[PDB]
Each structure stands twice: as structure tokens, then as C-alpha cells.
């Protein structure tokens, strides 16, 4: 796929999100489609409605509140948007791009009064047969890191070397998952072109791709062949030529990394290590999701729990739309036409969900899903960052949350 943006196709995808949730709600709560009607027009009767949370003006203030939100699909209400009256609802958390289901009424034509919120149901968890679990049996250690890997004012990978020595000779994990950026295109020396002569290279790199081959490849090559290593990019990776989410995987041969133990995965990607389902995505949902909140009970909860539940409910790793912007320098860079690929593969909730963030590292169980932010491997100043270690005790529900221990370790 090329760099094309097609408005009809983008709009198709946004329409389909509303429609597919309409079917999930109808099956879960066992409602008939005749119970759903168009909330954008007046009725005498209470109705069920499903739609996307949007601002009530298309040119809107940075800071939203419960009085400045609107909610339809093309079939549901000819795509019309209707202001939300949330005054009869004491507890809520909404965000722009959220798909939601309501019970309510448009009494007079110009507002839809929400009487209750029908919570979206949590997706199912993967299962395994007894045979498969016995093979896996015949503890599991997974290490997870996330870039940047060098500081803002130099090109030292000394900390990464120290780390590699540690995993090779002490920790000895089965798998290492490394998230980009590796060479971050917004690194301030890279951005300004203040790139020095490297006396430890016989021939100087002429491009950022060559800088990766001379700087990272030789150090990555030293990771033990016994440790399978997975690379997942960022849209800030200079080495990627696909700078939109969802992002195609890097090409391992081009990075001159050995087949013996390196796999390049897409951003996002989902995979199993033994029975454990991982869902990995490298856009900072945890930083970006700005909730509009009402209620003492909702506000007293931890933000990271609420945000993880929104992601599980929305069944996509970056449900915010329009995606966030850094102001132009960088952003989520959503390729809206392919948001399909960012949905939970198979409709399954992952056992472990890893979504690196610039917020402080964390590991939390939410709705029986282990949610992990390993933090940045090095800090901008050059001080130690962090990484995550996952140790898991060796049809059936994996109950990874009951068997997994996650440590957040100073790198």
C-alpha cells in the first residue's frame, strides 16, 4: 500500500466502526434492530442509539466538557450529528472517537438526552486445548524495551551494551521485544543535521539508514542467538519508509540483522509466545486519550485503569479520532483507511497488552488483561530509563494475570 488518502474510503471505515458495534451491542444485550432509531430527530419514545463521540462544533476549543459533545452511521441517522444532553447521567468517561451505546430520547428535536449508557462488552479471551498446553509445558521470560535508546545530546549506546550483557549472561530470557524509535527522526541532533564525524567507523554513514547499520546493527548482533528478538517500529523511525499507523514491519535483511534470532513485526502486531497472546502497539494511547469525566466514582479511579478499559471496549489499540498532533513535528499519523488492521485480531482480547508511553512505566491488571508500559529505555538527559521483565509460571483460559509477574527495572 502506497501514500494515498481517499476521503470516501476513510469515511467508509468510520461508518463501519459504528455499524459493527451496533451488531455487537444487539447480540450482547439481545435487542432487536427495531429497538434502535435515529437519535438526531424528535421522538415521543425512548430509543437505543449507537454512535461516535464527536465535538459539537467542527472547529472546537482544545478543552471539552460534558456540555460540548455530540453523537450516527449512514443508515442509522443519515450520518447526522446530534448534541448530547448528559445532565441525567452522573457517572461517565468519554473521549473523541469513542463508539458508544445509549438509551435515551430526543424530546424536542435539538438534543438527545441520555438516560443510560449501555457499556460495551469486553471481548473474549483466547483459549487453548489441553494438548497445546502440554507441548508448551514441554518459567517463561520475556523482556520488553522501548526507544529512544540514546540520549538527546550524544550517540552513546553504552547503556544498551550493558543491558545486552545482562540479558545474555544473567537474565537469559526466551524472547526480547524491542519497540522503536531506534533512530528517532525528531531527535534534536538528527532534526537539526548536527551530526558529527564518528571516529569509530572506518567509513562514515551518508544517510540515516546507513547510520543505523553502523550504529545499531553491530550492537544488536551481539544479542544471544538463544534469545528470539522482535522489533516493532514507531512512525518516528527514520529507518522505516512507512510513516503512518498502522505501519508495515521493518525489513530485516535491509537492517542486516541475522535470521537466526531477529523477527520484524508490524506496528501494531499480535502474536503468541507459547500460549500467551500479546497485543503490541506503538502509538501513545495512554498519553493521548483525553477523557471528558463526570462523577466522584469515575474520577476516584486510576486514569490508567479507565484508559485501559476504553481500549478493551473499543477493540482497537488507538481508538482516539482524530488522532493527536504535535505542533508541525510529529503525531499519531493515522492512516484512517487502514484502521481495520489496528482492531483486535480475531476479536480476542490479548492476554498481555503492551502500549509504550512517554508516561512513567507501569504494569497493571485490568479486566483480566496484563497492561504494560515499559517506559523509555534511556532518558533524554542520558540518565537510566527502564524496561519490563515478564516472568510467567509454566479448552482452557490462560489466566496469564494469575501466573505472570511484571517487574519494571532500571535499565
Amino acid at each position: 500500500r502506497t501514500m494515498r488518502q481517499n476521503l470516501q474510503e476513510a469515511s467508509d471505515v468510520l461508518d463501519d466502526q459504528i455499524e459493527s458495534f451496533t451488531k455487537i451491542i444487539q447480540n450482547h444485550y439481545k435487542l432487536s434492530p427495531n429497538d434502535f432509531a435515529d437519535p438526531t430527530i424528535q421522538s415521543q419514545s425512548e430509543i437505543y442509539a449507537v454512535g461516535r463521540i464527536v465535538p459539537d462544533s467542527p472547529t472546537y476549543d482544545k478543552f471539552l466538557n460534558p456540555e460540548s459533545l455530540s453523537l450516527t452511521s449512514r443508515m442509522g441517522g443519515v450520518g447526522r450529528r446530534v448534541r448530547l444532553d448528559l445532565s441525567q447521567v452522573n457517572e461517565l468517561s468519554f473521549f473523541l472517537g469513542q463508539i458508544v451505546a445509549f438509551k435515551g430520547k430526543n424530546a424536542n428535536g435539538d438534543y438527545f438526552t441520555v438516560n443510560s449508557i449501555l457499556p460495551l462488552p469486553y471481548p473474549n479471551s483466547p483459549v487453548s486445548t489441553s494438548q497445546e498446553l502440554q507441548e508448551f509445558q514441554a518459567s517463561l521470560k520475556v523482556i520488553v524495551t522501548c526507544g529512544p535508546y540514546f540520549a538527546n545530546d550524544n550517540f552513546s549506546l553504552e547503556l544498551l551494551q550493558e543491558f545486552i550483557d545482562s540479558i545474555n549472561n544473567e537474565v537469559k530470557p526466551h524472547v526480547l521485544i524491542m519497540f522503536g524509535p531506534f533512530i528517532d527522526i525528531t531527535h534534536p541532533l538528527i532534526a537539526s543535521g548536527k551530526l558529527p564525524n564518528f571516529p569509530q567507523f572506518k567509513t562514515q554513514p551518508k544517510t540515516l539508514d546507513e547510520l543505523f547499520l553502523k550504529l545499531f546493527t553491530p550492537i544488536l548482533k551481539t544479542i544471544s542467538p538463544h534469545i528470539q528478538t522482535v522489533l516493532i517500529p514507531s512512525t518516528k523511525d527514520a529507518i522505516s519508509n512507512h510513516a503512518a499507523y498502522p505501519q508495515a514491519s521493518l525489513i530485516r535483511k535491509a537492517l542486516q540483522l541475522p535470521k537466526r534470532n531477529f523477527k520484524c513485526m508490524a506496528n501494531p502486531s499480535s502474536f503468541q509466545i507459547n500460549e500467551i497472546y500479546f497485543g503490541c502497539s506503538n502509538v501513545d494511547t495512554f498519553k493521548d486519550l483525553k477523557e471528558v469525566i463526570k462523577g466522584g466514582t469515575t474520577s476516584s479511579r486510576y486514569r490508567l485503569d479507565r484508559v485501559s478499559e476504553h481500549i478493551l471496549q473499543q477493540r482497537r489499540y488507538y481508538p482516539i479520532f482524530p488522532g493527536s498532533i504535535r505542533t508541525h513535528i510529529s503525531g499519531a499519523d493515522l492512516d484512517v483507511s487502514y484502521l481495520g488492521l489496528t482492531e483486535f485480531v480475531g476479536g480476542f482480547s490479548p492476554d498481555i497488552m503492551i502500549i509504550p508511553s512517554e508516561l512513567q512505566h507501569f504494569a497493571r491488571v485490568v479486566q483480566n488483561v496484563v497492561v504494560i508500559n515499559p517506559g523509555r529505555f534511556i532518558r533524554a538527559t542520558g540518565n537510566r530509563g527502564s524496561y519490563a521483565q515478564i516472568t510467567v509460571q509454566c479448552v482452557y483460559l490462560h489466566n496469564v494475570w494469575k501466573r505472570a509477574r511484571v517487574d519494571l527495572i532500571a535499565s
Binding site: 476521503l7 449512514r74 537539526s192 543535521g193 551530526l195 562514515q204 544517510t207 546507513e210 482524530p322
Partner: protein, 797 residues
């Protein structure tokens, strides 16, 4: 021996019938007047089938509908293949039509005609809807001007007190009337009228009537023929107080006697000078003003009352009322066309020109008081009237106004009255109507020498086969006319009898005039057969021939003094009649050698010529650029930090591409390749990121909002009710162009050819071949490596 035989002269239309006026022979070999009322005439309509439809389909639709509107029991109709070759664009060359015979006399709505653009799903055009009844009769029965008519089934008891004629009959159907071949005609009763008026309203003071009761057009009319009767009527101009003179106490009494005399005389032809559009009008209105009950005797149909609207239409009413008697006006358009040597066409002038006799005209003014008490003045004034009356007659006979017009009428197939009182158009019209209709065509709905070039256009039409159909109909018609004219001239050379010879000369003249008038058919703007493409075609060829006629004249060392399509004047260069005529004939032969059908002749011989204009003279006569227009510059920063746009190997106050690379002019430090390419790549990625921010903009200039919100109908604007279209504000065309621009900066061939876009306008404060060639090859490697960084993203796009 069992059929009614009449020589027809004129006609009139009334109550959807056609009346013919003419003469019948009696047992004593004398001829009296007669009228024939013709019933049963129909309009010939042709309905043009639609694509896929047939005439039978048409028959099914309109015939029943026509039976209703007109209230007819049955309507004769049948399929018929007809050809079309005129100016209506959507009609084919040939088609099967439905020919419908719609009677003029119908029980209902007889005055309502079927329009050509009648709405229907079976046909899309209708010809013949507005057919004139005289036209229908003449064309259907192949009547060619005044002639003898065999009339069978003549009803002698149907018509009662309808006319001023001696014999009145009728017929139920026009097919009962056929033309005979008899070439002779009966003598005509001619009555010369001369009227003296008075300006109060124009009022009539006196009338002179000179009767010639045996004018034979079959033999030349003897010069100075004397009238069988001469009478003058007069009323007093102020108060109440040769040949016969009759006095009346007032004008009403006078005009009453006039009408009575007209009835008894029963003339076939009324001769006069300026009758048509001067004196007949005065005569008519005065009979109207004074309520003369017998006013209709000026014609041959009897009416007790005038038309309702009587009091442009005045011309028709009078012409209609006169129907039955031919108006022989020597000074109307026809009369003038036979007397081109005149200039005013005043009576005395015409008399001089045509008869070589002098008459000094008295200016009679009856307003003058002397005419109420001075008997000698009154008598001299009446003498003037009598003289004018007999002069008018004599002139009309000398210029052969009747025979020529008759021959013209027989050739064109129109009415004698129309030839006498109309323009050329009428003849031009009917000659074609007869010609086309007979060959299955549908016609449209209603010394200096003066050389004669009148035959120019008719020779062009014949030579180049120019016709509505294109040998075509028009050229063939002309060829026949020219051929017959030769046949006549051949017979003349041999003919000994002066009578037959004079007759031949009349025939020959008529044939000539007919041919030389044919151009009017297609050239006259208001012609029924007008065709601009043909007119222009004939006109252009006419210019060429005339232009080349000039060159020909000069090739004989002659000088063209003047020229036009009708005539060309040539200076012979001689001072002798003989030498002049020989030059003239030599030129005649030369012109014909180059144009076989163009036969010019010598019309005028000028021994001397004082010339000012054609009719003004005295003489002695003898007898990538646009693609990048909105891209933005690549901005580089020096690893001293000065920022500047990079425009390739081009001039700049900020940087220099030297033999060892890109150099900063502020601090002299050289960029390394990585220092350049990291910045190229960083800009690219900034652009690609902006592009993926997905800003949208609205079309509508009165709205224009920019937003990142996308409606589930993408193109639809989110402003309540706004009808504008939404478009990605960084289109993928713009992105691609931006990258292609970056690519161009590091393209060696483009750098060397100096085809890059300038980074600076001339008024910019920072405004800055063989050096570029050299420097580009010296930096090839740097360029190609810079270029590869752009290509990383261009193949991915």
C-alpha cells in the same frame, strides 16, 4: 361537341370555391363573357412518417381525427413516394408520404388550416396545409396561363345572378376541366380609362372611356387603331352647375352612370396609366364614399355590399373587386420593365419614347375658380383627358403589353393578372411550382459599347448544374428555354410572313425574359424558393467571370469603362461605327470561347460618352514549472546554525556548492553528506506527518472551515446546511509534487540544464553554465546520495 369550352382570363376566390372568368363563343361566331364556379377542389397534404413508422400508421391516426374536426364522412388518402430537395433540414431526399386530399369546402371549420408543425407520434411534418385554392387548381390540372378549357358536366341552372357575365355555369369537380392545345384566342374587349381628379380627399371630376372591341393578339395590332366608341363623363368641380360628352349634376350620378356603362360594355381589359396604385384606389374609395350600389361592375362578380374591412389590405380588396377584368397599366412595374428608355414614365414621356410623338401636357387644376364659369377652360381640360385616354391605349398596344404578358404567363403557368400587376417573383414562383410538382417533388409551402450580360446567371446555373437537387431540374428548365428560343430564331430567319414573324419575335422575347428572371427564384430574399447557399454560389461564379471578362477585354487592348452583373461598358478605341462594331463582336466571340453558354450582345453604341455613373451621363447614341508552483523550499540549517533554502547547484548568498561539497557562506564550513541527508529526510518526514494529520477544507468560499473531523459521508461539510465539498487540505497530489520538487534539487541532468525552480523572487532582499556543469559532475556522488533519500519515499508513493 358535347363539352362547354371557355377561354379563361382571370379568377377569384369566394366561399371556398374558385371562379374562372373568360369568354365563350356563340352560334354567330361572336364571343361573350362567362364565369365557371368550381367546386370539389382539395388541398394536397403530405404527412411525413416518423423513423420506423409508415404511411399506414399515419392513416390510422389523423384520418379519423380529420373526419371529426371537419365533419367529413370519408377522406381520400393513400401512400405516395415523394422527393424533397429544399431548405428544411430534417426532411430526407425521398420518403413514403401519406397523401391526404382535404376539401376546401367542408361542413365544419373550413377556414382552419393544418399547421406544418402539428404534434403527432406517427409523423413530424405536414406539407400543403396552407395551400391556396387557385394554386391547387392550376398545379393539379396542369393549367399554364390563359388558354382554352374543355369543361364537361357543366351545370347551366345552378348559378343565379352571381356575375356581370353573359354565361354562368358550375362544376362539381375540377377534374372535369382540362386545357386544350388550341393556340389561337378570341378577340379582347379593351376599355381605356382616363380620370381627372380634384383635391378637396381625392375626388373625381371626369372620366373618359375609349372602347376597342376587337383587339386580336393573334395578329399585330394596327398603329393608331381607332376606338369603336369614345365617351366622356363630367361633373361640376365647384358648384352644382370628339366622341360623346355627358354632363352630370354631381359626382355620385356620374359614377353611377360609369358603372352602368362598364357593365354594358363588359370589357375584358381596362387600359390606363398609373391605374393600379393611384387612380383605381381613388375610383374605389369614391364609389364607397358615395355609396354607389353598382360598384362591382368594375369587376365581373356581383356584390351588393363592400367587404367589412374596406376603408395594405386596400390593395387586395380592390384587386379582388376588379377580378374578371385585366388591369393593363402601362406605367406600373411590368409596364416600366418594357420601357427602360424612360426615366419618369410620365404619360407624355412614354408617348414620346414609344411612339415618337409629342404631346404637351396641360396642368389641370380644378380647384381654380375659372372652371366654374369659363366654358372654354372646361372644354380644354376635357380635351386633355380625352387625349390622355387615347394615348394610354396607343402606348399599351405599341409596347405590346398584352401579348408579352400573355406569353410570360403561359410560360410560367401563373395568372395573367399577376403578371400584369405583380413583380417578377410571381412568375419565378409558378414556373418552378409546375416544374417540380410534375416530376414528383414536394414544393415549399407559401466609341464606347454597352455589352449586355443579362444571361450571366442563367448561364452559370446551366453550365455548373446548380440546382436545389444537385442535370438538375432548374438547369434542365433553363436549357429547354434556351433551346426553344433558338428554335424560334431559326424559324424567324426563314419566315416571310410579317405577321408570323412578329409573333416569333414576341415569343423569342418572352423566352429570354423568362430565363433571365430565373435567378430571382433562389436569390430574392423573400422568394418561396430562396436558397442562400445557391445564391452565393451563383454570385461568386458571377464575380469571377466578370473579373476574367475584364482581363479578356484588356487582352484585346480594350478598357472597361464600367461594369456590373447586367452590363459591361468597353472603350473600343475606335472612332468609326464599323471598327467599333467589329471590336464589339470580336469581344463577344472571345467571351463565348471562354464561356460556351454565355452569349453577350451589343445593347448601346456611344459615339461619345460623358460619364458620371451608370444612369448619369450624356452621349451621342447611334441607331514541471507549474507542477512546483505551490511547493515549499527545502530549508537547511548549518551544522553556525544559519538557516537557508537550498535550491540545487544555483546561486545563493548563503551557500555555495564548491568542488568539495556544499559550503556555508557565513562560516565557510562544509556539510558532510550525513549532515545534508538527515535534513532532507527530516523535512520529508515533517511533510508526510502534516499530510497524515488529515486536515480537511471546505470548497464553499462563504464557509471555508478547516477541521480534522470527517463525517461518515466524507465529502459532506459539517456546517449545518452547507453544500460545499470537503477535500483533504494536503492532497496527495500536493505531497507527491513536493517530493518530486525535492527530487529535482538533487537531479544532475536538471541542475546542468538549469531547469530548477528559483528559490527567490527578484524583489527578495536575499536575491543572489560552465561552472554549474563542472560543479555538478564534481558533486555527482553527493547529489545521487541526496537523491536516493528522496527516492526512499517516492517509490513508496
Amino acid at each position: 361537341t358535347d363539352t362547354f369550352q371557355m377561354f379563361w382570363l382571370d379568377y377569384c376566390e369566394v366561399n371556398n370555391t374558385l371562379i374562372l372568368f373568360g369568354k365563350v363563343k356563340l352560334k354567330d361566331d361572336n364571343c361573350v363573357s362567362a364565369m365557371v364556379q368550381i367546386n370539389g377542389l382539395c388541398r394536397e397534404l403530405f404527412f411525413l412518417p416518423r423513423e420506423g413508422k409508415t404511411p399506414t400508421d399515419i392513416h390510422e391516426e389523423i384520418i379519423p381525427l380529420l373526419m371529426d374536426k371537419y365533419g367529413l364522412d370519408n377522406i381520400r388518402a393513400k401512400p405516395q413516394k415523394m422527393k424533397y430537395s429544399f431548405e428544411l433540414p430534417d426532411i430526407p431526399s425521398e420518403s413514403d408520404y401519406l397523401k391526404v386530399l382535404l376539401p376546401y369546402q367542408t361542413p365544419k371549420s373550413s377556414r382552419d388550416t393544418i399547421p406544418s408543425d402539428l404534434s403527432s407520434d406517427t409523423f413530424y411534418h405536414v406539407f400543403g396545409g396552407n395551400s391556396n385554392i387557385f394554386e391547387s387548381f392550376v398545379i393539379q390540372n396542369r393549367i399554364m396561363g390563359p388558354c382554352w378549357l374543355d369543361i364537361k358536366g357543366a351545370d347551366f341552372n345552378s348559378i343565379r345572378n352571381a356575375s356581370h357575365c353573359a354565361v354562368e355555369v358550375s362544376v362539381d369537380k375540377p377534374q372535369n376541366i382540362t386545357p386544350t392545345t388550341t393556340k389561337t384566342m378570341p378577340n379582347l374587349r379593351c376599355l381605356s380609362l382616363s380620370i381627372q381628379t380634384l383635391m378637396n380627399k381625392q375626388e373625381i371630376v371626369s372620366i373618359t372611356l375609349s372602347a376597342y372591341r376587337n383587339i386580336s393578339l393573334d395578329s399585330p395590332i394596327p398603329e393608331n387603331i381607332k376606338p369603336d366608341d369614345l365617351c366622356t363623363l363630367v361633373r361640376p368641380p365647384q358648384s352644382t352647375s370628339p366622341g360623346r360628352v355627358r354632363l352630370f349634376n354631381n359626382e355620385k350620378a356620374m359614377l353611377s352612370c360609369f358603372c352602368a356603362m362598364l357593365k354594358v360594355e363588359d370589357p375584358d381589359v381596362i387600359i390606363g396609366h398609373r391605374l393600379q396604385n393611384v387612380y383605381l384606389d381613388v375610383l374605389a374609395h369614391r364609389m364607397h364614399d358615395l355609396n354607389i350600389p353598382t360598384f362591382s361592375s368594375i369587376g365581373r362578380r356581383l356584390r351588393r355590399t363592400w367587404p367589412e374591412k374596406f376603408g395594405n389590405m386596400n390593395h387586395f380588396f380592390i384587386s379582388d373587386i376588379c377580378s374578371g377584368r385585366l388591369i393593363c397599366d402601362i406605367a406600373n412595374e411590368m409596364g416600366q420593365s418594357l420601357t427602360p428608355k424612360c426615366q419618369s414614365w410620365d404619360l407624355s414621356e412614354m408617348y414620346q419614347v414609344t411612339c415618337e410623338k409629342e404631346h404637351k401636357p396641360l396642368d389641370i387644376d380644378y380647384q381654380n375658380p375659372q372652371y366654374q364659369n369659363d366654358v372654354n377652360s372646361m372644354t380644354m381640360a376635357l380635351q386633355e383627358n380625352i387625349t390622355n385616354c387615347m394615348i394610354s391605349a396607343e402606348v399599351s398596344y405599341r409596347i405590346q403589353l398584352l401579348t408579352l404578358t400573355k406569353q410570360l404567363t403561359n410560360l410560367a403557368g401563373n395568372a395573367w393578372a399577376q403578371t400584369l400587376g405583380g413583380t417578377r417573383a410571381g412568375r419565378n414562383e409558378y414556373i418552378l411550382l409546375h416544374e417540380f410538382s410534375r416530376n414528383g417533388f414536394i414544393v415549399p409551402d407559401k466609341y464606347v459599347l454597352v455589352m449586355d450580360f443579362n444571361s450571366l446567371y442563367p448561364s452559370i446555373i446551366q453550365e455548373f448544374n446548380i440546382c436545389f437537387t444537385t442535370q438538375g431540374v432548374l438547369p434542365r428548365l433553363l436549357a429547354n428555354l434556351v433551346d426553344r428560343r433558338r428554335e424560334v430564331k431559326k424559324v424567324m430567319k426563314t419566315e416571310t410572313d410579317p405577321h408570323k414573324r412578329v409573333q416569333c419575335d414576341i415569343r423569342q422575347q418572352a423566352l429570354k425574359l423568362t430565363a433571365n428572371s430565373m435567378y430571382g427564384c433562389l436569390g430574392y430574399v423573400n422568394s418561396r424558393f430562396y436558397a442562400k447557399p445557391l445564391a452565393m454560389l451563383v454570385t461568386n461564379k458571377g464575380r469571377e467571370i466578370l473579373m476574367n471578362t475584364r482581363q479578356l477585354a484588356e487582352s484585346m487592348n480594350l478598357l472597361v469603362v464600367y461594369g456590373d452583373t447586367d452590363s459591361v461598358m468597353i472603350d473600343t478605341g475606335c472612332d468609326n461605327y464599323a471598327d467599333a462594331i467589329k471590336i464589339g463582336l470580336g469581344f463577344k466571340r472571345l467571351v463565348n470561347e471562354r464561356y460556351r453558354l454565355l452569349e453577350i450582345d451589343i445593347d448601346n453604341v456611344f459615339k461619345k460618352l460623358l460619364l458620371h455613373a451608370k444612369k448619369k451621363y450624356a452621349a451621342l447614341t447611334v441607331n514541471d514549472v507549474e507542477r512546483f508552483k505551490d511547493t515549499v523550499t527545502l530549508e537547511l540549517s548549518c551544522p553556525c546554525d544559519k538557516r537557508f533554502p537550498f535550491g540545487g547547484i544555483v546561486s545563493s548568498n548563503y551557500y555555495r556548492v564548491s568542488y568539495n561539497g556544499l559550503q556555508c557562506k557565513h562560516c565557510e564550513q562544509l556539510f558532510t553528506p550525513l549532515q545534508l541527508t538527515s535534513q532532507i529526510e527530516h523535512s520529508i518526514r515533517a511533510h508526510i506527518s502534516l499530510y497524515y494529520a488529515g486536515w480537511l477544507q471546505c470548497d464553499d468560499s462563504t464557509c471555508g472551515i478547516v477541521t480534522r473531523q470527517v463525517s461518515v459521508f466524507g465529502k459532506r461539510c459539517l456546517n449545518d446546511g452547507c453544500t460545499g465539498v470537503m477535500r483533504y487540505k494536503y492532497s496527495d497530489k500536493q505531497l507527491y509534487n513536493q517530493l518530486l520538487y525535492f527530487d529535482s534539487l538533487f537531479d544532475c541532468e536538471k541542475n546542468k540544464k538549469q531547469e530548477l525552480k528559483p528559490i527567490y523572487l527578484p524583489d527578495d532582499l536575499d536575491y543572489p553554465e560552465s561552472s554549474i556543469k563542472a560543479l555538478t559532475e564534481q558533486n555527482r556522488e553527493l547529489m545521487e546520495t541526496g537523491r536516493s533519500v528522496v527516492q526512499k519515499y517516492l517509490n513508496d508513493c
